[PDB]
Design a protein around this nucleic acid. Sequence first.
DNA 1: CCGACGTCGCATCAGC
DNA 2: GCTGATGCGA
DNA 3: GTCGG
Length: 327
Amino acid sequence: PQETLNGGITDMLTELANFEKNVSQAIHKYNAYRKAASVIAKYPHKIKSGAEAKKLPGVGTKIAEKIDEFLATGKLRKLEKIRQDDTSSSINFLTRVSGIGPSAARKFVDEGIKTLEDLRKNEDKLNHHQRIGLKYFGDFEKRIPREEMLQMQDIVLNEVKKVDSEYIATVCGSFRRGAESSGDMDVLLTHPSFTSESQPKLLHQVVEQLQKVHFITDTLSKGETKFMGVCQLPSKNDEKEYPHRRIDIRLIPKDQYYCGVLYFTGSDIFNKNMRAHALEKGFTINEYTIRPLGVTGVAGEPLPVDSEKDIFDYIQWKYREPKDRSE
DNA sequence: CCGACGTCGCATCAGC
DNA sequence: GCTGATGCGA
DNA sequence: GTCGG
Ligand code: NA
Ligand code: NA
């Protein structure tokens, strides 16, 4: 399916999806619209009617009508009106700043703050996270070429081992699935001296080293188990400098690492197929563990997992490369 | 007819 | 000062 | 908004 097929409809739905989350604060309607956008995007036929589309899982009466209106006119009256609404479009925009959610974006537009300009005129009203998001508003909306991700992974794997060679680190996300680009970098971290049944400076020291070699530039949030911050490659001598990137590092217990690795590798749809799979075989998988039920449906103690493949074995199915994990 | 729709670590703030 | 709901991101 | 119990 090419974009030109039903891309006109998906954009309509994606726009509608954003206004639900950001303006109406109806997060479940937001996911509903996105779900429809996805299933339509995979649909290898130029849709001729709302009735044709309503056949698909995720699309019902109300969306079918909108598709009819779009097909008949080329536009949607409601979306047109809300694109042009000064309050709503401003609220919707401000949320594109990382750190600004639909709630904060509400109060800003309430007291008159609508634009990035206005945000810069009033930074003492922004918190630490929001200032970073504002500062790198453009960079964050860029994607990362796999080549840069590789160079980023190069730096991360090196400085981690340099801190302590017993560390294990794995860059997951769409990147591990061989994607040609990424939106950020998700690093999963563990150590033999960290288990579910067991220092509380393991995460700090990795972050510390990456700040020393000037790879990590800012910090959105940092606790004992998860780091959310900003990073940047060394500018290639005389050349044009790199965009700042979003990077997440989280520390996972050794006996939950590969379950964490499996989970955050994805994809989303792959993961649902594999956890619904799965119940049929009599196991429950979350991001942390895999547990056995249980004739009445009562889970037992989480089975030991020492590799990704280990999990596949439990549920009787031949190991899959991250490459082939899109569904 | 009406509830589920993913979940949770960290920063911030409301209540006390 | 402490407890913990809410906002936010993923 | 969609699905389904
Ligand atoms: Na349907
Ligand atoms: Na945001």
